[PDB]
Amino acid sequence: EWKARRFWASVGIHKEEGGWAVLLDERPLRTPGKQPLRLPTEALALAIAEEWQAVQEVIDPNAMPLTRSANSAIEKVAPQFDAVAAMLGDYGGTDLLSYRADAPEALVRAQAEGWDPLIDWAATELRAPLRITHGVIPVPQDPVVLLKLRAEVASLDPFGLTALHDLVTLPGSLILGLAVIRGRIDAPTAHALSRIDEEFQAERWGRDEEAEAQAASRLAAMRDSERFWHLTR
């Protein structure tokens, strides 16, 4: 626990060759793995410095989302870039916006009004029109569309791919993720769209405390990813 106490007075950033560095007094911040922490932009450097300047008495890895995502980018995503990109790309074949409920009518309508504009956006802007199904039996997507979607993901930089991760896996939609990083919608909107079903059920049959707690947790993480994406551009 001694290792968690703050021992610095000031936090600053330094140019540094391979990206920006964050300095606790004179000492460079490093990743939990001893690897030097290098950020692609001064905007992210500055934001991470604020997290470390805000440390009270003890370091709380949970109150430091930007630092945590930067560590992941450096230690996990960049080195396994292709694998991560392939995994996010797979969501194109099982995208939430592609599966509509069969009933009741009011829910089918809610899904169409909320999701059809995003499916349209994907067909128009990403040239990735998705086949949509009603029910639970998986419908086959055009192989070419799936490849374009995987390319959209794989064309990202490592810090950007790190941001996209939660924006796709939490709501369970590659389109909602891409729509956020492309500015078509913001994270809170993507979160609201992803839970049309959950919200529908809640209003008609009653809220579920744990599900609401789980949704609040997903939204917070999605906003963290969105913030990380913008700071790293």
Q: Are residues 115 and 226 in the same domain?
A: yes
79 and 56 within one domain: no
Q: Are residues 57 and 13 in the same domain?
A: yes
Q: Strand 21-24 and strand 11-14: pairing?
A: antiparallel
Q: Which residues contact 228 (CB under 8 A, 6 or more apart)?
A: 44, 65, 66, 69, 159, 162, 163
What's the CATH number where 31 sits?
Answer: 3.30.2180.10
Residues 232 and 149 both lie in one domain: yes
Tokens encoding 142 = 């055009």
Q: In this structure, are 103 and 170 located in the same domain?
A: yes
- Assign residue 119 the CATH number of its domain: 1.10.3580.10
Write the CA distances from 71 to 15, 86, 145, 193, integer angstroms.
19, 21, 33, 30
Cis peptide before 117 (omega within 30 of 0): no
What residues contact residue 218 under an 8 Å CB cut-off, 6+ apart? 170, 171, 191
Residue type for position 71: N
Q: Which two tokens stand for residue 167?
A: 């924006």
Both 105 and 162 in one domain: the answer is yes
Are 44 and 76 part of one and the same domain?
A: no
DSSP track, 35-102: -B--BS-HHHHHHHHHHHHS--SB--TTS-HHHHHHHHIIIIIGGGHHHHHHHHHGGGGG-GGGEE--
- The H-or-E segment that residue 86 falls in is helix 81-89
Q: 208: which 2 tokens?
A: 């579920």
Tell me which residue range forms the domain holding 25. Answer: 1-63
How far apart, in whole angstroms, are the C-alpha atoms of residue 86 and residue 90?
6
Q: Which of 27, 42, 63 is the last residue of a domain?
A: 63
Whether 187 and 77 map to the same domain: the answer is yes
CB-based contacts of 113, cutoff 8 Å, min separation 6: none
